[PDB]
Amino acid sequence: TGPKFDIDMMVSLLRQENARDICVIQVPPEMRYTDYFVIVSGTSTRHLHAMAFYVVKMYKHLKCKRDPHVKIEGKDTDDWLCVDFGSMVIHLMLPETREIYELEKLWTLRSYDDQLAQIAPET
Amino acid sequence: AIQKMTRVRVVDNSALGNSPYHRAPRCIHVYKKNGVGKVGDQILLAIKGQKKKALIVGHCMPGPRMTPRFDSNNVVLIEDNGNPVGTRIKTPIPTSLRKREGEYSKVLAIAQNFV
Amino acid sequence: GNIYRTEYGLKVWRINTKHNIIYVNGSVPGHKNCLVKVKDSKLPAYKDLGKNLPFPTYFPDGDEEELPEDLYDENVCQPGAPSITFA
Amino acid sequence: APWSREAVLSLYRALLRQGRQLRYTDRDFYFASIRREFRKNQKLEDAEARERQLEKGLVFLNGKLGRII
Amino acid sequence: HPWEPGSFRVGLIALKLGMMPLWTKDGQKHVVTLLQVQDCHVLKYTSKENCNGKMATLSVGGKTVSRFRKATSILEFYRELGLPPKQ
Amino acid sequence: RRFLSPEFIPRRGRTDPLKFQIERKDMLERRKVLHIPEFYVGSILRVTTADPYASGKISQFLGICIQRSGRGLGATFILRNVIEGQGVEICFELYNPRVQEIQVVKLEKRLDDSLLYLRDALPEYSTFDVNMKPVVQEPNQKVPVNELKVKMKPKPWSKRWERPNFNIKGIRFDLCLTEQQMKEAQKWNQPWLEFDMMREYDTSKIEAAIWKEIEASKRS
RNA sequence: CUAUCUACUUUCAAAUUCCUCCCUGUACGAAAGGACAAGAGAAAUAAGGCC
RNA sequence: GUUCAGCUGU
Ligand SMILES: *P(=O)(O)OCC(C)(C)[C@@H](O)C(=O)NCCC(=O)NCCSC(=O)CCCCCCCCCCC
Numbered sequence A: 001t002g003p004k005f006d007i008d009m010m011v012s013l014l015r016q017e018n019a020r021d022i023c024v025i026q027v028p029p030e031m032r033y034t035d036y037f038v039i040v041s042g043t044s045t046r047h048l049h050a051m052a053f054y055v056v057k058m059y060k061h062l063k064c065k066r067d068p069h070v071k072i073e074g075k076d077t078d079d080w081l082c083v084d085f086g087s088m089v090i091h092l093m094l095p096e097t098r099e100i101y102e103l104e105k106l107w108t109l110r111s112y113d114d115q116l117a118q119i120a121p122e123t
Numbered sequence B: 001a002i003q004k005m006t007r008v009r010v011v012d013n014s015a016l017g018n019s020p021y022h023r024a025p026r027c028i029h030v031y032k033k034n035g036v037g038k039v040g041d042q043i044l045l046a047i048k049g050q051k052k053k054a055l056i057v058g059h060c061m062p063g064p065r066m067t068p069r070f071d072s073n074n075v076v077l078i079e080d081n082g083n084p085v086g087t088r089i090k091t092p093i094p095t096s097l098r099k100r101e102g103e104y105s106k107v108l109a110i111a112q113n114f115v
Numbered sequence C: 001g002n003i004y005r006t007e008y009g010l011k012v013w014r015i016n017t018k019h020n021i022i023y024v025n026g027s028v029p030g031h032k033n034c035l036v037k038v039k040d041s042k043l044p045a046y047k048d049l050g051k052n053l054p055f056p057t058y059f060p061d062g063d064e065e066e067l068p069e070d071l072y073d074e075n076v077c078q079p080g081a082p083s084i085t086f087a
Numbered sequence D: 001a002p003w004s005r006e007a008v009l010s011l012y013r014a015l016l017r018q019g020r021q022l023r024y025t026d027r028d029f030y031f032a033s034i035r036r037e038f039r040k041n042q043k044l045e046d047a048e049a050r051e052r053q054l055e056k057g058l059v060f061l062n063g064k065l066g067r068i069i
Numbered sequence E: 001h002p003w004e005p006g007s008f009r010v011g012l013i014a015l016k017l018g019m020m021p022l023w024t025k026d027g028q029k030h031v032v033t034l035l036q037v038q039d040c041h042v043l044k045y046t047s048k049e050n051c052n053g054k055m056a057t058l059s060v061g062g063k064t065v066s067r068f069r070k071a072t073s074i075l076e077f078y079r080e081l082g083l084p085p086k087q
Numbered sequence F: 001r002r003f004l005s006p007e008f009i010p011r012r013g014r015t016d017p018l019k020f021q022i023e024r025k026d027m028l029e030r031r032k033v034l035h036i037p038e039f040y041v042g043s044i045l046r047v048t049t050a051d052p053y054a055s056g057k058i059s060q061f062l063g064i065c066i067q068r069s070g071r072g073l074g075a076t077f078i079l080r081n082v083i084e085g086q087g088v089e090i091c092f093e094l095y096n097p098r099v100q101e102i103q104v105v106k107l108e109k110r111l112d113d114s115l116l117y118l119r120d121a122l123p124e125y126s127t128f129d130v131n132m133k134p135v136v137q138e139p140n141q142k143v144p145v146n147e148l149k150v151k152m153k154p155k156p157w158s159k160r161w162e163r164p165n166f167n168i169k170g171i172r173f174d175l176c177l178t179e180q181q182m183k184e185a186q187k188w189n190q191p192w193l194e195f196d197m198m199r200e201y202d203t204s205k206i207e208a209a210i211w212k213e214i215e216a217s218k219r220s
Numbered sequence G: 001c002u003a004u005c006u007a008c009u010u011u012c013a014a015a016u017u018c019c020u021c022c023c024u025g026u027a028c029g030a031a032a033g034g035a036c037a038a039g040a041g042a043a044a045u046a047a048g049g050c051c
Numbered sequence H: 001g002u003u004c005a006g007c008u009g010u
């Protein structure tokens, strides 16, 4: 009875919930945010809310009392949901919103990202 | 730190923030009972003739020890639903936002530098 | 000013047995080098926690292992402890 | 040809090689996303700009700033 | 006697030395006041009946002070007790 | 030449001396765990701390020291740097257990004991490379005094740095202030202040006693 | 108010509030819907103090 | 002439 809630568990849950484009980024310790960065696409707003609760429902089950509780953010929005567990941050975004922010490039190319090269979204 | 009429600097790459305007962005309302805005506090701005929600990511007023104090009062523009208007933040933002009460994962995700 | 006031519910972080110093949370009324009356907290939450405190008082003459120079609270970072990490 | 046409082609093969050892990231998504950057965003450029894109790709390949699992 | 629910033990008189920062393992800072117990002794005991109160009373004394600046009546009380006068 | 950290020397007041002895004991115990190096206002430091908000991940901030203030366990220093064109200052607590290391990248003294005017100076004077390598300090040599005089930005400044009360010597006033502005500042000059003997605070005897405590702790 | 008179110059210290989490997707609920206190954290205000 | 920008214990 010792299945901890780790990155391997979360990706399993996400794949079980039909995550379209799972992208796990290993954030180095120098970047003082999280150990892992997860960006998942969803078919619709209803899908994002469902898989967001399922991961938090499973986390609450497979967590110690000392471990802090987690809050699902972005419920007011329909396109983008994010859950900051503490060692993993999972961002659930719709396909169109995911392209706009290009979070994969930012967290893999911290200071070399194209948008951070003064290519601002004037659109 | 930030009050009504306080001029603020937009540190995101949003078109609204970076567009040239004769009037500098000014705080018109602070979403706190005391009307005093700190880091991690939402405010309403008068920017380019519009009313846009913003989040305070840095201010000149000294805060607690071990926390960064900035030369300017820095804000990031957010939509009514909490999404950030800009896609990137190049100005260093404090890490205390992560554990401050409220929703800040969206802003932290687009932040290039932490201090 | 110059009147008696009470600060209720101040926790004892640390005790110095050698110098008989009580480290109490926050601030107490009065100037430094003034005499203060210290008493068990009367607040309802802190009622009946004297079960583990010296009763009627602490007698160092009594037969017990001599207390360490400093007594600390479980959460207090002691001066000679290693630098803390939050992992 | 930022530094050489072989370097860009060498980088493209290198990144694709990494995409086939992805434990968690969807390999289909990784390959398509890599294609889009090389095929469209950076295929047609100028001499000076080309160098920045190659340095960006090398930074992505090393993974010191961030790695894709 | 052993401690029983509903018991109220005595307190003490301390001198306020000053304030110091204290840190906890969760990374929070706490300012504390140093209270030093100087020549604190029990001086008098009064039973419930004689005290005109529900609870008995214990009189406690604080810092030692000069005998040359105290009233004769107070000086006579401490003479019987065998302790220097308190502030 | 032996340097006594400024926070050990207490400020004038009615505090019982025992309170300082107790606090100095806690300070010396923390110094055994963490090496606090000798540095001054104007020196470049890199401070490493464990981040509570990032699950204890270590953070490094490099900046010039512009202020050293406080006494006892709470003593602090402010480091200033310009990151991505943004001026940032952090007030660090020397004895905070979060601090993992305090490294002196460059050891020097500036013309002033405080460098708060750097906020009003050109950004270059506050910009230091975060990856700069420590310069070696020659053994048994006097701390070098940097005599740089900074050029200021157009007024108004945060404070009236020209006024005599600040007694600043590291600003090129001639470049930014006219002769009339300089003379107007002298109005606030208080020539008698430097000759007020009763205001003097002599800590020679106090520092000597502190050194005995510092030596005793090292021996044991 | 250059304040003569009346009154008054410590009713000493029981505290309010909004949010987040939790309880809980639990009691109820045909079902949807969805508690209440119990708590936890974070804010602000007020009162009292403190460096 | 305003707005704006700027400064101020208003
Ligand atoms: P061919 O005709 O032999 O050669 C074609 C050439 C190379 C000549 C042509 O493409 C060209 O002129 N290119 C210009 C320079 C160039 O191509 N530079 C390489 C760009 S490197 C690059 O784009 C790296 C991208 C890094 C970010 C990837 C993000 C992936 C996210 C994955 C999420 C799971």
Ligand SMILES: [Mg+2]
Pocket (backbone or CB within 6 Å): F158
């Ligand atoms: Mg000012």
Ligand SMILES: [Mg+2]
Pocket (backbone or CB within 6 Å): none
């Ligand atoms: Mg007050």
Ligand SMILES: [Mg+2]
Pocket (backbone or CB within 6 Å): none
């Ligand atoms: Mg104006």
